[PDB]
Structures are given as structure tokens and as C-alpha cells.
């Protein structure tokens, strides 16, 4: 109304559209987050920090795979302790805002698991290169 420009050039507009909506739009959100006497320091710090944040996130995305698709399968199963909701409930009713309030726990658990499944794949690929 609004549309993608306001929602993602601007931010967080889709938070009220439930997470299934995201599948058609999470593109622009990323590109518009990378924009660009004593005040010179204030401005330089801001610019540098924005860059650092961006790059650090890219580093994790790289490490875990896949990663240029923005939506990736990492071939790690879910722990049953995290399966207290139906998938339809998650995708059709819940928002990212809402999901994120509870799923926020075990952050590093997920990261650990992601790093390791990727490491295993990599070894298998190296063996295949060596075998072939």
C-alpha cells in the first residue's frame, strides 16, 4: 500500500503479515540495511560499525552454508524438545517477532549443530575428491 518499498526499504513492515508472507519478500530488507570537526569521528564510527556488523553476519552465513540463497537447508534434524508446536501454526499464525520470543533459547546450540553438520559434509566431499 506501502508495498515492498515501504515494508523493506523502510523496515519491519511485514512483521504483522505472519512469517509465511516472508517467503515472497525477504530481499530488499537486506540491501537497504547496507546503505551509505569532531562529528567526523561520530560519523566514521557509525559507518565502520555498520560495515562490521554486516560482515560478521556474512561470515557466519558462509561457515554454515549454503548460503547465497538466503534460505537454506542444513540437514540437521530438530531436537524433540523444540517441537511443541505444529508446523502450520508456525508458518501461518506466528510472526517472526513472536516466534523469536521463545525460540531465542538455545541459540548457541543451533549454531554448534550447524557448524558441525557442515564440517561433516566437507570431509565427505574431500574424500570424494580424493577417491575420484
Amino acid at each position: 500500500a506501502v508495498g515492498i518499498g515501504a515494508v523493506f526499504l523502510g523496515f519491519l513492515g511485514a512483521a504483522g503479515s505472519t512469517m509465511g508472507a516472508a517467503s515472497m519478500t525477504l530481499t530488499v530488507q537486506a540491501r537497504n540495511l547496507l546503505s551509505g570537526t569532531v562529528w567526523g569521528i561520530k560519523q566514521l564510527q557509525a559507518r565502520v560499525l555498520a560495515v562490521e556488523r554486516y560482515l560478521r553476519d556474512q561470515q557466519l552465513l558462509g561457515i554454515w552454508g549454503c548460503s547465497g540463497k538466503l534460505i537454506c537447508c542444513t540437514n540437521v534434524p530438530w531436537n524433540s524438545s523444540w517441537s511443541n508446536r505444529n508446523l502450520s501454526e508456525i508458518w501461518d499464525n506466528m510472526t517472526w517477532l513472536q516466534w523469536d520470543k521463545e525460540i531465542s533459547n538455545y541459540t548457541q546450540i543451533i549454531y554448534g549443530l550447524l557448524e558441525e553438520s557442515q564440517n561433516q559434509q566437507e570431509k565427505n566431499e574431500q574424500d570424494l575428491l580424493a577417491l575420484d
Binding site: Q126, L129, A130, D132
Partner: protein, 462 residues
């Protein structure tokens, strides 16, 4: 099969770095008043943990006298000090003819307390007030071209304008646990014996160095670390008479200093804004600045040093002597206890020699016998030879005392062609670089160099 090349990103190798470190202040010296704390206000607080490594089978070459890091440290101290004193206390108005007279005379150290009067600017520029204060070291100089008259000048009127101090600022060493920037890492030697250079085999990683409290001192060094196992005698070149020997002692020695006299303080407003501080009075008795050190411990130390020193100077007697001579800034021990600046004559701390037997013989006793050194206190000093950064001390109201857990030693060597049966060791110092070098040496800074290459023979299908 035939060999094919692969590239390996992120391999664990390194090269010597030429970079800078930073605060890393201790996050404990921080309180509201930190803005009044020298070299803390300016710094960022951190709280990093120690590193587990242990680099296993890795060994590496260290060299204390080539570690440029010390210069970074030196340069910053000079610049930090100076910057912290800019917005206050310009003393230019003080340089007027001073009129004065003798204390009591008698003791040379009391005679100096001159009753000094002058005519100066009041709140209204048009008027002058006749006022007075006590001064005593010859920072007060007989006026040029007078003839034994009551007229004097300030010592820095044929040099450059001086400042006093922003009165609010605290000068107390806070350890800075210097940390590396991303892409850099710090390595340290955990080895004993270590000459100051060579292939350390017990090597550990460092994220941040152990913090070191800066100290300005000469000759005997205070508030440093102790050797873990044995006295270490270190020198760039033992045979080069121009080099200074650095000694790390194993056990602590305690030093107690004081300025016993009940002192008062007064201040004078000079023109607008800024007030000047000076000693008001000293209510009746007579002072002697001094430092009492146990003799017992002292003799034990000198012979233990002599025993180790004997390794490089075998079959010879070790003799100690006094400094070469010069201004107190050159020849005396220097302390900043309480914020006051002391000059302490070494006479007769190094009045001895030991027969090359160095017999470690002593006994239990109820004796508390000490060696007492006497001191002198100045008001205007050239901070680190910063004549252009000269400053006048604020007076402090009190019976000032000072401890310290001591000492590091700075020594030199002498003796001509007429000896070589004995060698003479004299007190040495004056370069701020060595004061830090002494502890900084433990660390080397390296750069992580990712991305290497190796053969594998494996090939990509494409």
C-alpha cells in the same frame, strides 16, 4: 600419480607484526571520579580472560632489545601526560621579583624555608596585593645581577612558561592489560633462564598482556613483579661498558618513606579564575625527608646478586661505588610518593664490596637495624626532561608516608686496566624505556597469516 594443487584457507601460521596495542584498562579503576584520574579517563575498560595455549610443540625466537612496542608505550606517556594538563594553571603571572629572608638558618635543609613576599594582581586588574608564601628549594634563584640582596627570581624565567597541575587530577599507576587488534596475536615466554633473547620453548598465547602499572623512577625500580625462581641478570651485551644491566630479584624488600612535618596550605587568587597553591606554614618543628630500609635484607641481596653475577665475571671481587655525579635528577633515586617528588641520595647504600666467596652467612636476632637515606623535595621539575613541559607541584597538607614492595635494579659497570681482579658496579638509569622494557619483554606481537597451499593429488570434476 600426477599431483594437483589445493588451497587451504585459514592455516595457523604467523609472521612478525609491526602494529599497535591499546587500552584494555582494568575496569576497576572506573568510578565517577575516573574523569579526574590520569591515564584512566582516556581509556576503555575491558575484562578479558587468560589464554589456555600452550602452543604445544611450537618454539619461537624472542628479543627484548628489539621490541619496538616499548616506543609506543613511551611516546603515549609523554603525550598523555601533556594533554591532561592543558586546560589549567598557567603560571606566567608568578614571574615577578620576589623578596625574601632566611628561615632560622641552622640546618641546611631548614634554612631554605624562605619567607617570600610579592605584589600581585587582584580580582580587579587595576590593583595589586602584597602577599606571601613559603618556598625553599632554589627554584627561587638569586636575581641575576644583584648583590646578595633580598631580590630573587623564579628558576624558569630564563627558560619557558610553566604550569602547576589541574588540582583535581589523581596520579596513580593503573595497570593496562594491552590487547591486540583483530588479525594480531601476542605470544609470551613462560621460560626461566631466558637471557632476554633466544628460542623460548615454553610458549603461550596472549589475548591481552598482563597489565603493567607504569612507574616513573630511576635506579631502584618499585611496584614491579618478582622473579619466580631465581635472580635474573640481564644485559644486551655483558662486555659492553655502555650497556645497563637489568636485575630481577627473587624476593621482595620493603621500603618505608616519610615526610614527618605537620604542613599547612594556602592559596592565592591571581587575577580571574585560577588560583595558585603554595605552602602556608610549617607549625614549629623541623623536617628531614627520609627512607629506612632493612640492612639485613639488603646485604643478603647484594651477595646473592654477586653470586649470580660471578658467572659472567668469574674469579673476581665485586665492588660497589657511587654514581658519576651531577644534578640530583641524574644522581639520586626518584620517587613520586604521595604525588610529591623526592630526590634520595644513594649514599651509602652502595658503600661495600664482597670477597668472591659471597658466603651466605647471617643469623637470627632481635635486631631491626636499617640503613637510612636522606632526601630532598623539589617543587618544580622537568618531567621526563620535558623542560618545555615544566611543572610546579601542588602542595599537600600532611604527615606523608610511603610504602612500596621493592625492587628492580638498574646497574652499570666500571673498572680500568689497573684492576681486572675485581669489577665495580655503580647505580644507573634515566631511560624510561628500560623501566618498562623490564617487564614488557615477556611478549611478542605477531600477525596471523591465513591462506596457504599444499599438494594433495585429488582433483575437481568439472
Amino acid at each position: 600419480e600426477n599431483l594437483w594443487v589445493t588451497v587451504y584457507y585459514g592455516v595457523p601460521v604467523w609472521k612478525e607484526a609491526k602494529t599497535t596495542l591499546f587500552c584494555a584498562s582494568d575496569a576497576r579503576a572506573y568510578e565517577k571520579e575516573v574523569h579526574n584520574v590520569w591515564a584512566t579517563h582516556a581509556c576503555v575498560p575491558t575484562d578479558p580472560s587468560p589464554q589456555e595455549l600452550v602452543l604445544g610443540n611450537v618454539t619461537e625466537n624472542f628479543n627484548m632489545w628489539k621490541n619496538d612496542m616499548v616506543d609506543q608505550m613511551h611516546e603515549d606517556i609523554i603525550s598523555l601526560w601533556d594533554q591532561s594538563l592543558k586546560p589549567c594553571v598557567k603560571l606566567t603571572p608568578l614571574c615577578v621579583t620576589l623578596i625574601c629572608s632566611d628561615a632560622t638558618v641552622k640546618t641546611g635543609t631548614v634554612e631554605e624555608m624562605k619567607n617570600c613576599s610579592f605584589n600581585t594582581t587582584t580580582e580587579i586588574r587595576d590593583k595589586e596585593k602584597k602577599e606571601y608564601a613559603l618556598f625553599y628549594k632554589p627554584d627561587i634563584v638569586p636575581l641575576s645581577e644583584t648583590n646578595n640582596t633580598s631580590e630573587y627570581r623564579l628558576i624558569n624565567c630564563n627558560t619557558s612558561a610553566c604550569t602547576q597541575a589541574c588540582p583535581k587530577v589523581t596520579f596513580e599507576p593503573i595497570p593496562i592489560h594491552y590487547c591486540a587488534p583483530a588479525g594480531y596475536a601476542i605470544l609470551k615466554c613462560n621460560d626461566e633462564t631466558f637471557n632476554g633473547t633466544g628460542p623460548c620453548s615454553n610458549v603461550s598465547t596472549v589475548q591481552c598482556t598482563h597489565g603493567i602499572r607504569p612507574v616513573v623512577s630511576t635506579q631502584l625500580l618499585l611496584n614491579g613483579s618478582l622473579a619466580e625462581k631465581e635472580i635474573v641478570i640481564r644485559s644486551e651485551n655483558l662486555t659492553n661498558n655502555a650497556k645497563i644491566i637489568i636485575v630481577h630479584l627473587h624476593t621482595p624488600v620493603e621500603i618505608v618513606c616519610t615526610r614527618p612535618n605537620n604542613n599547612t596550605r594556602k592559596s592565592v587568587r591571581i587575577g580571574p579564575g585560577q588560583t595558585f597553591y603554595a605552602t602556608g606554614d610549617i607549625i614549629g618543628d623541623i623536617k628531614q625527608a627520609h627512607c629506612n630500609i632493612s640492612e639485613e635484607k639488603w646485604n643478603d641481596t647484594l651477595q646473592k646478586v654477586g653470586i649470580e653475577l660471578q658467572k659472567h665475571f668469574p674469579n673476581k671481587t665485586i665492588k660497589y661505588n657511587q654514581s658519576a655525579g651531577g644534578d640530583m635528577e641524574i644522581t639520586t633515586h626518584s620517587f613520586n610518593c604521595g604525588g610529591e617528588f623526592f630526590y634520595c641520595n644513594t649514599s651509602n647504600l652502595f658503600n661495600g664490596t664482597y670477597n668472591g666467596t659471597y658466603i651466605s652467612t647471617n643469623s637470627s636476632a632481635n635486631s631491626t637495624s636499617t640503613i637510612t637515606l636522606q632526601c630532598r623535595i623539589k617543587q618544580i621539575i622537568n618531567m621526563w626532561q620535558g623542560v618545555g613541559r615544566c611543572m610546579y607541584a601542588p602542595p599537600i597538607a600532611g604527615n606523608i608516608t610511603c610504602r612500596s614492595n621493592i625492587t628492580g635494579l638498574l646497574l652499570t659497570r666500571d673498572g680500568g686496566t689497573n684492576s681486572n681482579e675485581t669489577e665495580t658496579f655503580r647505580p644507573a638509569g634515566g631511560d624510561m624505556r628500560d623501566n618498562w622494557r623490564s617487564e614488557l619483554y615477556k611478549y611478542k606481537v605477531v600477525k596471523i597469516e591465513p591462506l596457504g597451499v599444499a599438494p594433495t593429488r585429488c582433483k575437481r570434476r568439472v
